Design an enzyme around this catalytic site. Sequence first.
Site, PDB file in Angstrom:
ATOM      1  N   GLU A   1       0.843  -1.201   0.000  1.00 31.12           N
ATOM      2  CA  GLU A   1       0.000   0.000   0.000  1.00 31.12           C
ATOM      3  C   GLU A   1       0.893   1.273   0.000  1.00 31.12           C
ATOM      4  O   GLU A   1       1.896   1.326   0.717  1.00 31.12           O
ATOM      5  CB  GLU A   1      -0.896  -0.063   1.221  1.00 31.12           C
ATOM      6  CG  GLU A   1      -1.932   0.973   1.301  1.00 31.12           C
ATOM      7  CD  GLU A   1      -2.829   0.723   2.518  1.00 31.12           C
ATOM      8  OE1 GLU A   1      -4.044   0.620   2.347  1.00 31.12           O
ATOM      9  OE2 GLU A   1      -2.273   0.602   3.613  1.00 31.12           O
TER      10      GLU A   1
ATOM     11  N   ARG B   1      -4.271  -4.636   0.380  1.00 34.67           N
ATOM     12  CA  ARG B   1      -5.556  -3.964   0.200  1.00 34.67           C
ATOM     13  C   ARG B   1      -5.878  -3.756  -1.283  1.00 34.67           C
ATOM     14  O   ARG B   1      -5.043  -3.990  -2.167  1.00 34.67           O
ATOM     15  CB  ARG B   1      -5.634  -2.640   0.992  1.00 34.67           C
ATOM     16  CG  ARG B   1      -5.761  -2.847   2.493  1.00 34.67           C
ATOM     17  CD  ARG B   1      -6.650  -1.787   3.101  1.00 34.67           C
ATOM     18  NE  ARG B   1      -6.628  -1.898   4.546  1.00 34.67           N
ATOM     19  CZ  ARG B   1      -5.934  -1.104   5.347  1.00 34.67           C
ATOM     20  NH1 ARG B   1      -5.171  -0.138   4.838  1.00 34.67           N
ATOM     21  NH2 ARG B   1      -5.990  -1.290   6.668  1.00 34.67           N
TER      22      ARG B   1
HETATM   23  N1  LIG Z   1      -8.464   3.774   1.590  1.00 42.63           N
HETATM   24  C1  LIG Z   1      -7.711   3.887   2.718  1.00 42.63           C
HETATM   25  C2  LIG Z   1      -6.644   3.168   2.914  1.00 42.63           C
HETATM   26  C3  LIG Z   1      -5.969   3.218   4.027  1.00 42.63           C
HETATM   27  N2  LIG Z   1      -6.221   4.142   4.889  1.00 42.63           N
HETATM   28  C4  LIG Z   1      -5.294   4.472   5.965  1.00 42.63           C
HETATM   29  O1  LIG Z   1      -3.933   4.365   5.519  1.00 42.63           O
HETATM   30  C5  LIG Z   1      -3.103   3.913   6.601  1.00 42.63           C
HETATM   31  C6  LIG Z   1      -2.229   2.762   6.070  1.00 42.63           C
HETATM   32  O2  LIG Z   1      -2.973   1.560   5.911  1.00 42.63           O
HETATM   33  C7  LIG Z   1      -4.021   3.582   7.769  1.00 42.63           C
HETATM   34  O3  LIG Z   1      -3.951   4.666   8.714  1.00 42.63           O
HETATM   35  C8  LIG Z   1      -5.391   3.471   7.127  1.00 42.63           C
HETATM   36  F1  LIG Z   1      -5.581   2.208   6.718  1.00 42.63           F
HETATM   37  F2  LIG Z   1      -6.361   3.811   7.943  1.00 42.63           F
HETATM   38  C9  LIG Z   1      -7.341   4.882   4.761  1.00 42.63           C
HETATM   39  O4  LIG Z   1      -7.704   5.729   5.683  1.00 42.63           O
HETATM   40  N3  LIG Z   1      -8.093   4.758   3.653  1.00 42.63           N
END
Ligand SMILES: Nc1ccn([C@@H]2O[C@H](CO)[C@@H](O)C2(F)F)c(=O)n1
Lengths: 225, 242
Positions: free
Chosen positions: B35, B110
Site C-alpha cells: 500500500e 488492500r
Molecule cells: N483507503 C484507505 C486506505 C488506508 N487508509 C489508511 O492508511 C493507513 C495505512 O494503511 C491507515 O492509517 C489506514 F488504513 F487507515 C485509509 O484511511 N483509507
Amino acid sequence: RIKKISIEGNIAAGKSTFVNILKQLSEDWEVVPEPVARWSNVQSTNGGNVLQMMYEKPERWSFTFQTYACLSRIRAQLASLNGKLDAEKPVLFFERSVYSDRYIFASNLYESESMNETEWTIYQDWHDWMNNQFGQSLELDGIIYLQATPETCLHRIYLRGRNEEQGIPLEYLEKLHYKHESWLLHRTLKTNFDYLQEVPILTLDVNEDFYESLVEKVKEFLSTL
Amino acid sequence: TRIKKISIEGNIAAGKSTFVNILKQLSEDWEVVPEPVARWSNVQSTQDEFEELTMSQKNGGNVLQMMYEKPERWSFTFQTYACLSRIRAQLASLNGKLKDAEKPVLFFERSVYSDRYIFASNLYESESMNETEWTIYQDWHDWMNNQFGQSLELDGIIYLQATPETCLHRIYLRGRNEEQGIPLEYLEKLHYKHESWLLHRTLKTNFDYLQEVPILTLDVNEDFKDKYESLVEKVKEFLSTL
Ligand SMILES: Nc1ccn([C@@H]2O[C@H](CO)[C@@H](O)C2(F)F)c(=O)n1
Ligand SMILES: Nc1ncnc2c1ncn2[C@@H]1O[C@H](COP(=O)(O)OP(=O)(O)O)[C@@H](O)[C@H]1O
Ligand SMILES: Nc1ncnc2c1ncn2[C@@H]1O[C@H](COP(=O)(O)OP(=O)(O)O)[C@@H](O)[C@H]1O
Ligand SMILES: Nc1ccn([C@@H]2O[C@H](CO)[C@@H](O)C2(F)F)c(=O)n1
C-alpha cells in the site's frame, strides 16, 4: 486517425456557440462539450452543484471541483473517440482540454491560494498519471483560441445568466486571460507535455457581436493539419 | 495476465504488511504490491527532467495526517489520492513483475474495493464526506474500474482478522504518529465493514464477480510465532484451489 482540435478561451468567450456552429459544416465533424451539466447536478452514472460550491467557497471546494472537472472531461473525450465518427475525414472538437484544466484553471486557483501546496501537488500527480495512461489517445492536432477581452467575457457571463457565475469579478477574468495569452499567444507557459509546443494554434478574435469569416478560417486551418 | 492476483485485507495494523512480506519469501513466483502509505505521508509529484538535476525532490505535505486531523475537510482528497496511487502501483507491478515465473502470484496489500467499500464508505457514513463528495468519489471509482478493473480483477482475497482491540494495540506498537489518536470506536466501525464484506458476505458492491471470489479468513490475533505455521499451510492450500 480522428483529428482532435481543442477550442480554448476565457469564460463566456463563445466556445460552445462557435463549436455548435462548426459542427454543422460536416457530418465528419463532432464535438465534445464541456460536461458543465454534470458539474451543475452531480450524479453518479438532483445532486449538488459543485461548480456553485467552488465559486461560493473556493478555498474549500476548488480541488474537488478541479479534479472532477478533469475526470469528467477525460471520460467524455474518451467516450467520443470510441464511438463517434466511419467518417471520411473525422474531426473531433473538444470544448477546452486537460491542459487548460491544469495549466490555466487549477494553476490560477493555486496561485490565488484557493488550493494549498498539498492539494496542488496531489492534483498535478493525479493529472500526470491520468495523462500517462490516456495522453496518447487524447493528444491534440491543433488548438483554436477564441480571444475575447475580459470585459467582453464579463458582459457575456451576464448575457448567458448562469447564476453561479454572476458574481465573478473582472479581475478574476483578467487573470484567466493573462494565462490564456501566456499559453496560446506568447507561448511562454511551460507544460510537461512536450508535444504541445509543436501543436499549431489558430487565434480568432471574437470580441465583436456575432462570424462567417472566422468559420471559414477554421475549415481551412483543418486542411493544413 | 497469467498472474494470479490476491488481495490481503484487514483492519489498520492487523499485520498485513508483516505477514505478506514474510510469506512472499516462500516462493520466487510470489511478489507483493505494498500500500502506498509513504506516498500519502510525504506528498510528491514528478520533477521536470532538467529541474531535477539542480533541485532536490522536497518533502511534501502529509495528507494522511490531514485526514486524521480534520476528516470532514480532508477525507475526500485523501481517499481520492489513496485509490489513484494504489491503482498506479498495482498496474505498474502487473505490467512489470513476475515475467520469469512458473506459477506467478501477486499479492496486493488492500484493494480498490476496500478503499471504496470500507474506508471511503465509512467516512461517508460518519458525515466526514458529504453527499456531493461521496457521489463524485463513487463516479470516479466506477469510471476508473471500467477502464482498469479487468487488469486488476482479483482471483482471491485473504482476510486477516484481528479484533479492534488487537489493532489498537498494534497501532501503538508500530508508532505511526498520525495514527496515535485513533479511538477504538473508529477501529470497531472498520471491523464491522470488513466482517460484512468478507465474513458474512452481505455487503453489496457494484462489482458482480466479488460475490463469488474465493475468500480465506485467518485469525491473526495471536503473537506472530504462535500461528504462522498454520497460516502458511492454510494459504498454500487456498492457492491450490484457485
Ligand atoms: N483507503 C484507505 C486506505 C488506508 N487508509 C489508511 O492508511 C493507513 C495505512 O494503511 C491507515 O492509517 C489506514 F488504513 F487507515 C485509509 O484511511 N483509507
Ligand atoms: N460573438 C458573439 N456575439 C454576441 N454574443 C455571443 C457571441 N458569442 C457568444 N455569445 C453569447 O455569449 C454567451 C456565452 O457564450 P458561450 O458559447 O456559452 O460561451 P463559452 O462556451 O465560451 O462559455 C451566450 O449567451 C452566447 O449567446
Ligand atoms: N502477529 C503479530 N504479532 C505481534 N506483532 C505483530 C503481529 N502482526 C503485526 N505485528 C506488529 O503490529 C504492527 C502492525 O503491523 P503491520 O504489518 O504494519 O500492519 P498492517 O500492514 O496491517 O497495517 C507492527 O508494529 C508489527 O510489528
Ligand atoms: N477546469 C475548469 C474548467 C472550467 N471551469 C469553469 O466551468 C464553467 C464552464 O465553462 C466556467 O465557469 C469555468 F470555465 F470557469 C473551471 O472553473 N475550471
